[PDB]
Design a protein around this ligand. Structure first.
Ligand SMILES: [K+]
Lengths: 213, 183
């Protein structure tokens, strides 16, 4: 019971079914070309390696089609026609679904690291490029005293590109983490026991301010 | 707070989502990895949640009589005759009763009793649950099914529940006993 998660089950079914089908098809074509056409008394034959067949089936699944290698037995060519009809649908659906699954992993995982005696403030609730810039413009304002407080955002969303830029610009003193203050593990991730303060921000433009409060 | 309090008010709260139980209490020393049945607020009898009823489906099937027993206790005695009388839609028909039906007022009841004083307190003074059990059944027909004990014996009024202690299980005069009784 090691495939504990639905995405991981789907991943291993995709990879194994694709690889096992590709390998077995390469074996069948390797048999056909090296054996030759039986209705030509095996006179028409072509000495591919298994690896040349394996390569050639990838070059045809992808529709790249060099023609550096190609089938020349009638059984080989008829197998290539069947293989094209079947495996273009496999490859063209497999590659995007693998790309979605490997694209799913959360970027802003991990945990904040506490510097020697340095203060930090956790910030949560309505976190967006708008609310964060409105906040940081005053909070990090140059006319304040040089106080070494670090700002640690904690929110469920992936940050939008404008916010990722703002976070990279302030990388020395601003951090962001995927999570919610509703989970004790996320509070531990941002080391909130050792934070100086925590700020909770409201979406002022929400559809029900009683619900937001 | 109140005049001549607070967290001493006895509460029971139904929860729609089990994991919210972590917010229900402080001085908690909990971990969110705990399942509901192990959490301090559930073990103290302060929380309840509909998820703990789910095995009523399976227990229903494995022993029908067990599902009747739980109903006869928790309902206080809602027999299928009452369910039929309510299903007539007339409302709950009542009045004075014949002695022949009124005899059923001798049902057994769930009760809770203290070892702090009264005839059982001798066992609360450092006796064992089996000594108490045998004595109380023998002299009163009172059948003991568990204990309710302070978590902070060394502090808070929280008490945890102990289903069916061993015979040699120690007692305190602060303990309260869950019992089945006829008076
Ligand atoms: K091509």
């Amino acid at each position: 019971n090691v495939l504990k998660t639905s995405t991981l089950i789907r991943l291993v079914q995709l990879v194994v079914s694709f690889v096992s089908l590709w390998l077995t098809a390469a074996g069948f074509l390797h048999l056909l070309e090296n054996s030759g056409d039986p209705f030509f008394d095996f006179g028409n034959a072509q000495h591919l390696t298994y690896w040349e067949c394996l390569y050639f089936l990838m070059v045809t699944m992808s529709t790249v089609g060099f023609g550096d290698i190609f089938a020349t037995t009638v059984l080989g060519r008829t197998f290539v026609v069947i293989f094209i009809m079947i495996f273009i649908g496999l490859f063209a659906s497999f590659i995007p679904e693998i790309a979605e699954i490997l694209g799913k992993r959360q970027k802003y995982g991990g945990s904040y690291k506490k510097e020697r005696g340095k203060r930090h403030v956790v910030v949560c609730g309505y976190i967006t490029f708008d609310s964060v810039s409105n906040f940081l413009k005053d909070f990090l304002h140059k006319d304040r005293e040089d106080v070494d407080v670090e700002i640690v955002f904690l929110h469920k969303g992936l940050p939008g590109l404008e916010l990722e830029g703002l976070l990279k610009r302030h990388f020395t003193q601003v951090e962001y983490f995927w999570g919610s203050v509703m989970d004790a593990n996320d509070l531990e991730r941002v080391k909130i026991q050792e934070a100086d303060a925590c700020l909770v921000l409201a979406n002022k433009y929400c559809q029900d301010p009683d619900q937001e409060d | 707070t109140f005049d001549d309090a607070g967290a001493n008010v006895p509460l029971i709260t139904e929860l729609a989502n089990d994991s919210n139980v972590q917010f229900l209490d402080q001085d908690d020393d909990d971990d969110p990895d705990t399942e509901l049945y192990m959490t301090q607020p559930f073990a103290c009898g302060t929380a309840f949640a509909v998820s703990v009823l789910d095995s009523l489906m399976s227990t229903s099937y494995f022993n029908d009589n067990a599902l009747t027993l739980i109903r006869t206790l928790i309902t206080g005695g809602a027999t299928p005759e009452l369910e039929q009388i309510l299903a007539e839609g007339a409302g709950m028909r009542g009045g004075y009763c014949s002695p022949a039906v009124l005899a059923n007022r001798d049902r057994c009841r769930v009760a809770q009793i203290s070892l702090f004083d009264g005839p059982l307190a001798q066992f609360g003074q450092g006796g064992h649950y089996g000594e108490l059990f045998v004595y109380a059944l023998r002299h009163f027909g009172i059948l003991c099914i568990g204990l309710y004990r302070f978590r902070d014996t060394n502090p808070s009024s929280k008490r945890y529940v102990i289903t069916n202690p061993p015979e040699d299980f120690p007692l305190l005069p602060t303990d309260q006993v869950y019992v089945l009784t006829y008076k």
